Amino acid sequence: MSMVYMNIMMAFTVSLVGLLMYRSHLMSSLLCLEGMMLSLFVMAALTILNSHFTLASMMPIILLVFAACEAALGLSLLVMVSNTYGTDYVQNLNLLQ
Amino acid sequence: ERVAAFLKNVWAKEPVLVASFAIAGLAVILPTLSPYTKYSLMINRATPYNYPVPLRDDGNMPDVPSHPQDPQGPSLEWLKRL
Amino acid sequence: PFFDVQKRLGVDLDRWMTIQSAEQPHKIPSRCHAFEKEWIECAHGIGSIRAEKECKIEFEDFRECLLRQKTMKRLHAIRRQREKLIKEGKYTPPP
Amino acid sequence: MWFEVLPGIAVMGVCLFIPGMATARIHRFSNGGKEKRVAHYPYQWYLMERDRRVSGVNRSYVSKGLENI
Amino acid sequence: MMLYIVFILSVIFVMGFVGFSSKPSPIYGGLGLIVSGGVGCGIVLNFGGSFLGLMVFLIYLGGMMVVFGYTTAMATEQYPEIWLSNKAVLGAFVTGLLMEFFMVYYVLKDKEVEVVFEFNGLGDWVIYDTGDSGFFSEEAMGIAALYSYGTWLVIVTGWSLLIGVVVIMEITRG
Amino acid sequence: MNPIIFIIILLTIMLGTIIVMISSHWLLVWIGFEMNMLAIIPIMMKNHNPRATEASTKYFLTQSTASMLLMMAVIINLMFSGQWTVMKLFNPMASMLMTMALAMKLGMAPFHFWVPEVTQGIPLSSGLILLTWQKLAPMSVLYQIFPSINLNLILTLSVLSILIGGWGGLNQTQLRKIMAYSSIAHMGWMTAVLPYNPTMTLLNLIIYIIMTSTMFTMFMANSTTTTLSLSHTWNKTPIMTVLILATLLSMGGLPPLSGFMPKWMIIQEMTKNNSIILPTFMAITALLNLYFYMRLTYSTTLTMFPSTNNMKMKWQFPLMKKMTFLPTMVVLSTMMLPLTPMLSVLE
Amino acid sequence: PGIVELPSLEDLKVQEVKVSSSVLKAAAHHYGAQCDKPNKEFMLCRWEEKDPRRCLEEGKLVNQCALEFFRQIKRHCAEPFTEYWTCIDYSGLQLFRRCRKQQAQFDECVLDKL
Amino acid sequence: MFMINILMLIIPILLAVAFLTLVERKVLGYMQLRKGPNVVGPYGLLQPIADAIKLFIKEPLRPATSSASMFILAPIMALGLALTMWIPLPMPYPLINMNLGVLFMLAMSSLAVYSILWSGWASNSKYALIGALRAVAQTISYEVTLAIILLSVLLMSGSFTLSTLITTQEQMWLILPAWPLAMMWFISTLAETNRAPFDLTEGESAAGPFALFFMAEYANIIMMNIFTAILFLGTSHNPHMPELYTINFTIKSLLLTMSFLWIRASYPRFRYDQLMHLLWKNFLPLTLALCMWHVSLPILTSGIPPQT
Amino acid sequence: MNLMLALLTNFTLATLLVIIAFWLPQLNVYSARLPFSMKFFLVAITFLLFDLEIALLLPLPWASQTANLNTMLTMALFLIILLAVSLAYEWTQKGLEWT
Amino acid sequence: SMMKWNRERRRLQIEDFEARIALMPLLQAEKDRRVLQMLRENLEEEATVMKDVPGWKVGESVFHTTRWVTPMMGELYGLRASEEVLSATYGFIWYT
Ligand SMILES: CCCCCCCCCCCCCCCCCC(=O)OC[C@H](COP(=O)(O)OCCN)OC(=O)CCCCCCCCCCCCCCCCC
Ligand SMILES: CCCCCCCCCCCCO[C@@H]1O[C@H](CO)[C@@H](O[C@H]2O[C@H](CO)[C@@H](O)[C@H](O)[C@H]2O)[C@H](O)[C@H]1O
Ligand SMILES: CCCCCCCCCCCCO[C@@H]1O[C@H](CO)[C@@H](O[C@H]2O[C@H](CO)[C@@H](O)[C@H](O)[C@H]2O)[C@H](O)[C@H]1O
Ligand SMILES: CCCCCCCCCCCCO[C@@H]1O[C@H](CO)[C@@H](O[C@H]2O[C@H](CO)[C@@H](O)[C@H](O)[C@H]2O)[C@H](O)[C@H]1O
Ligand SMILES: CCCCCCCCCCCCO[C@@H]1O[C@H](CO)[C@@H](O[C@H]2O[C@H](CO)[C@@H](O)[C@H](O)[C@H]2O)[C@H](O)[C@H]1O
Ligand SMILES: CCCCCCCCCCCCO[C@@H]1O[C@H](CO)[C@@H](O[C@H]2O[C@H](CO)[C@@H](O)[C@H](O)[C@H]2O)[C@H](O)[C@H]1O
Ligand SMILES: N=C(N)NC(=N)NCCc1ccc(I)c(Cl)c1
Fold it and tell me: In Å, what is the CA distance from D54 to each residue of D29, D39, G23, J27?
């Protein structure tokens, strides 16, 4: 495949590994989740644009809209977690062990 | 009568919202009543974005012009006089 | 679909975007329209088990148009042989 | 008096006039005394590249008329 | 060379991902994502996606990432820890850059690399469409088609966004 | 929650699932999962306590990660086939991602860790939706892409789920954790038979939904969430102990109860394909589930645990919870084996 | 797979219409009326054959009719035409509506003389 | 040649901002029955030079910041974005002719809020971060109506190209069919730029860095008012005499900018919750209703503009 | 290239002005939760969701060129009404209050 | 007033589009020869560079089908000067 697909696929993997290798801040994982979406948007746009598949041109927008609404829900849960323990650390979310 | 005294109250207390609802109401209703709405579809149709690929003449196409300036084919005389 | 409501009700909810050879705004074609068109018509109505073997030629051509992996491999081969020959002074590009 | 506010307004007005005047005159200088070609769509770009080839000097703004027929 | 602008942008794209994926303070992690988003728009612009590229700035960067930074200021951090002051972040950051560099060094030299999968290195320009002279933006025609072909897409997208408002109010009420 | 808003949120959950099941386009399938997840979070959060917040957060991260992997599979498929049709995938790497994404959504082992915790942290009524309705959408996709699924991967996920679900349930006293591990084990049977006969996946799914809905409804009727709370039912609603007994034995796959039928029909399909070791191993491992169902029957129905003095006050008040469809569900949970050939309606 | 047949370099030579886009823009409306027959025969060939190698002969007749079209302007209306397309050429968008005065002079000249 | 063109846009903008400070002081002065600067140079014409030099040789006394990187970043982003807003402006020709220039300006203006947010982080002060967040909330809120209003106007114009707004208004200013939108647009620009009566950052609340934030903010004031003139008071363009367009276009921008000063001199300040209500409960309802109206109006009148 | 040159010049000049501002001869020889309302968070989220709906509305100037005007107008008005509905929901649920 | 002016602007757009349609046959004919000349030129270079590479046919197709296939950029400018390739590739996107 083309060169760009190498780096775009790599960026998705890097953000996936970042997401699966949590640290402390819940916000840091939400950023890796949004990084995955960014690379998905770029990968889909490149494919759709290069192939001249015209009706699919709206698809990256729909992906952006739903993902952002999905990110809004994630931020709402982060603030509720932060209102409970005073931080967004993920090690506080262990009551259900 | 009951509705008339309702409108007077909102107009006095919430004129901004009364205007909003009225403007939005006109936007949903007027296109169905306007006599010019049909020309919007006609003009959009008449705009030639792509090439008009000619047909192969089989001898049974009396309604297809042989030349752009021939009297057959869609006309835009209605649009010029619009 | 798991429940084919669209076919049964005769309503097009999302089939219009499924393939690139479907109707497009202003008849804009996709770059691989003819290849997808040929592969779809070969494989129509015979099932994926049969299609994977009997329409293999069309799918191989279609995949070549999509990703151009063979074409790039051939150009990369001619490019290798030139910038090699140019070093041995055995080739002179035209004006 | 209020007309002692005008000199500062004149300076600011001259400052905001230079960009529009400079851009228009730089365009004429760089495009053979004509407006810079606007190519927003592929068709307009295709004609501009065709003009470059036809011009004979690799400038899309050098025009060739019936003299070249 | 300028012919490799897309590849160059995609290289920076990856480094930005290593930047925030190694997960420094979310203040800097947000900065790394903003830079990746801007570079991501640049890649999309060079494939003819003017409208799609500007949506990244307007929606992804000017919208979602502003709220991310806004929330970080309230609920996550106010002051940042010194960048790379943590061993794990630096180790991950150095690990990613070296992996990226080895990928780039070999593909440039060979005009093709095999990182798990086979990738060409001739240039992205080689796969481009050759003939074009329509008097419109095809990318714009497709997005405009959302209102004439995608009635279904509009309804479900419109419904989901309304539900997002309802749901978030329920979540945050307490 | 306002009762009107609760209904609207419930319909959005249902609509998200329906979109997945009627879509022929991968983007609309992904939209269905997104819509469904968006509307399920408020019902997990509806009692506003730290445990509910933790459950919703753990659920959000797991489902969001899976939906990203699903979209990645969809785009890889687009790269290598140039189309969006919901069917077999045209790239092995896309198939693995989509399969793992759906296994994550279903909670199959070894992506199972969230199911016991999320179920424990949300109300019984929310757990009922989580462990029943939420399986429909991922299973309906698996039903359509199974020709391209790697056989070794899907059977490995199935075997691990039956083992993990069986072993996990042995150590549980919380009723919601017991149900969660029961769910993991039962997803394993559904996916083991998927490569061979998808109809038996649907049969196992439907029967599992009926029995699980029965158990959750009976737990709600008495507001029981622990083994010891459930052991008081004999001194309040003796009938309920008999229904719980029968349903648990059915969930254990004992003949002649309805829960035998899916295990029986699945064994038949795999033997027809010359698969003998796998069905035998699965059936034996399913005895682990039968053990901790039997334990519940001992403390609930077959023995009378100690009571408390204040229970006498409960004798004077009627059972006022809706218990909707319980008489129908419990009868179908136990007495359907004579009607087994009716499984062809699913064909 | 076989070898892609390609016409010889001398099978593609022809007299090209070497005029700028504003010249073609100014002449387009009369050009479309005068050279319709070979033009539409060529476009019918392209959309039917879907192969540029198969319409090379008809493509050549497109040039000949266009060169003859312009040789006929140069022979009767050279000065009204030069004024017109020079006005078109000045506009950055090559607008028709800026040059109605010069367009009328050219239109009258071709109508009277041709 | 293009490099000369860039400088002949950047440099005049900075000088225009410098002398806007003089004009504002003198216009406010005379509306207050006084004169304003008239000693430092004739009619105060050297007052901006004195202020600029004074500010740049002042002690750059910054107390320790939370992060050095974002302390430098915030003003660079502010000034860089402000200069970038000018490159698509048709005056009558743009430095860069963008097919989607209108969308480009919306995108670039949505990033301006980062400079505010980063300033809050770098202040190393809890109280300054709260003021930065209050400012961001005001800005993004009024971004909502600006986007929708702009969309409604473009439905009569037909494209996102800024120079097409000139063609659309060849016969008539867009203020006439859209004066309800122009009203809300104009107030929204005031709220967007933290201008009185929306200057709550100042009400609620050095050296070169301060001067750079100030210059960027005043460059945005001029640019917003240029954009208002283009959007609603279209100047006729004669391609053979482009300077005639530039003269008339500049006059309209100066009058619009001077009206910002006029409004500052005339009104008290909104309370924070009251300007949030002005948008969410007043402008936004009308803007939504007017957006519906302007989607329908070209269709029902057969007045859809050309796509090119 | 022109646009990249413009952007480079704008931000490079901004960088230069910022550094010379910081440098001059002085002639001298000697992570938690802000006490900040949940209402401000709700403003940001509300902006975000509306900003996403504005993204869906931006294509409208192009969409008005379609021949399927009946469908285009119905979906355009549908999207704006639902945006108005969400505003009405927030309003009635006391979501636009500060007390 | 806006209805009158926008209607006139639609008529002006149709007149502009029709001018393009009149010219498209001539432009299409020119494009065909240019593509075929560029492919014929690349073939001659290939016949010389790969004149005896073990087993290399010259001008062989990668597609099973014999149908004409539109070449991509790499197949047309693959052996030409960089500035032509930049202009052919990114020139339109960068004109702005
Ligand atoms: C036909 C084809 C299908 C074949 C598969 C088999 C189907 C049968 C399973 C049907 C589903 C279970 C429903 C069983 C109905 C039970 C009702 C009953 O018999 O009475 C329960 C009894 C009454 O209690 P109560 O009414 O509250 O007060 C009594 C005051 N007079 O409650 C009590 O008094 C409690 C008594 C103590 C508990 C004793 C437990 C041992 C008896 C359990 C019998 C049921 C076992 C079901 C397993 C299947 C049996 C083959
Ligand atoms: C005309 C069609 C044009 C399309 C319009 C687009 C649809 C937009 C739907 C918005 C629906 C809002 O509906 C609105 O709800 C509130 C409920 O508080 C009602 O208002 C009511 O509640 C408020 C509480 O805040 C009270 O102060 C008020 O006295 C009472 O009347 C309004 O009477 C009604 O206008
Ligand atoms: C909460 C959901 C809210 C959804 C609100 C949806 C509001 C939709 C309102 C208007 C929808 C249709 O708007 C308009 O209606 C009339 C009704 O004939 C249509 O019909 C009109 O135009 C056509 C076009 O040729 C003419 O042939 C016809 O004679 C004329 O009556 C218009 O083509 C359509 O543009
Ligand atoms: C949460 C709310 C849920 C409510 C669900 C309501 C269901 C809504 C169904 C929408 C789809 C209706 O059915 C579909 O409509 C669109 C537009 O009218 C039609 O689509 C039409 O527009 C374009 C124009 O070419 C093409 O897609 C197609 O050529 C044409 O038919 C489909 O032919 C029709 O199948
Ligand atoms: C959770 C980790 C997520 C990381 C995601 C990383 C992105 C993955 C990109 C996968 C896209 C490439 O996927 C891979 O491409 C090559 C190129 O033809 C295919 O081709 C390869 O396998 C088949 C095997 O018969 C043949 O095509 C061929 O022999 C071989 O080249 C692979 O079958 C396909 O699996
Ligand atoms: C816009 C271009 C203008 C070009 C003009 C170039 C002139 C360069 C000469 C600068 C002379 C500055 O003069 C000097 O400025 C600094 C500003 O902090 C003052 O302050 C400095 O000295 C005092 C003590 O004296 C220290 O406490 C302080 O920390 C230090 O900053 C000095 O008191 C003043 O003597
Ligand atoms: N705000 C005003 N109108 N003036 C004022 N009172 N203070 C600002 C003065 C100022 C700030 C920066 C620069 I550079 C310049 Cl030249 C002048």
Answer: 21, 17, 12, 13
Which residues have CB under 8 Å from H108's CB, separation 6+?
E57, H81, H84, H85
DSSP state letter for F301 = I
- Kindly state whether residue I98 falls inside one of the protein's structural domains: no
Q: 3-state DSSP: chain A helix, strand, coil percent, rounded to 5?
A: 80, 0, 15
Tokens 């007149």: give the residue: J15
Q: Using an 8 Å CB-CB cutoff, list chain B residues near G47.
A: 53
Q: What is the resolution of this structure in A?
A: 2.3
Q: Which residue has the tokens 């954790």?
A: F177
Q: Measured on CA atoms in the order B64, B68, B74, B75, is the torsion positive or negative?
A: negative
Where b means 16+ CB within 10 Å and e means fewer, A22-45 reads ebebbbbbbbbbbbbbbbbbbbbb
CB F247 within 8 A of CB F322: no
**C-beta atoms of J92 and D50 within 8 A:** no
Domains identified in chain A and CATH numbers: 3-85 (1.10.287.3510)
Ligand located closest to C24 CA: 4
Residue I38 belongs to a domain with what CATH number? 1.20.58.1610
Put simply, the answer to whether D64 touches G89 (Cβ < 8 Å) is no
Q: Which residue has the tokens 């088990």?
A: C49
CA distance B77 to B79: 5
Q: What is the topology classification, in CATH, of domain E4-169?
A: Four Helix Bundle (Hemerythrin (Met), subunit A) (1.20.120)
CA distances, B35 to each of B41, F25, H306, J7 (Å)? 12, 40, 21, 16
Give the whole-angstrom CA distance, residue F172 versus residue C40. Answer: 54
Q: State both tokens at H57.
A: 């040789």
* Contact call for F51 and A80, based on CB within 8 A: no
- Chain B touches chain G, with at least 3 Cβ pairs below 8 Å, answer yes
How many Å apart are CA H174 and CA H234, to the nearest integer?
A: 7
- Degrees, nearest 5: CA angle F154-F118-F214: 80
I17 assigned to some structural domain: yes
Omega within 30 of 0 (cis) for the link into E24: no
Q: Which residues, 6+ apart, have CB-to-CB distance to I11 below 8 Å? A: H76, H80, H84
Residue I33 lies in a domain: yes
Instruction: Parse chain E into domains and list their residue ranges.
Output: 4-169
Technique used to solve these coordinates: cryo-EM
Task: Tell me how close the Cα of C32 comes to any Cα of chain B, in angstroms.
Answer: 19
| Helix or strand run (H / E) with residue E118 | strand E117-120
Per the CB < 8 A criterion, the answer to whether H111 and I33 are in contact is: no
E158 close to A (CB below 8 A): no
Q: Which residues of C touch F15 (CB under 8 A)?
A: none
How far does CA J33 lie from the centroid of its chain?
10
**For residues F142 and F154, what is the distance between their CA atoms, to the nearest angstrom?**
10
Distance linking the first and last C-alpha atoms of chain A: 45
DSSP strands (E only) in chain J? none
Query: Nearest CA to CA, how far is E55 from chain H (Å)?
Result: 8
Cα of I80 to nearest chain H Cα, Å: 7
Torsion (CA) A81, A86, A91, A96 in degrees, nearest 10: -50
- The verdict on a CB contact (< 8 Å) between E2 and J71 is no
Best residue among H13, H17, H21 to mutate for probing ligand 7's pocket (most ligand atoms within 8 Å of CB) is H21
Residues 6+ apart with CB under 8 A from F58: A93, A96, F114, F117, F118, F121
Tokens, residue C7: 């076919």
Q: Probe ligand 2: pick from B14, B21, B30, B32, max atoms within 8 Å of CB? A: B21
Question: For chain I, how many structural domains are there in total?
Answer: 1
Cβ–Cβ contacts within 10 Å for residue C78, how many? 18
Pick from B66, C26, J24: nearest CA to G42: J24
CA gap F88, F102 in Å, rounded: 14
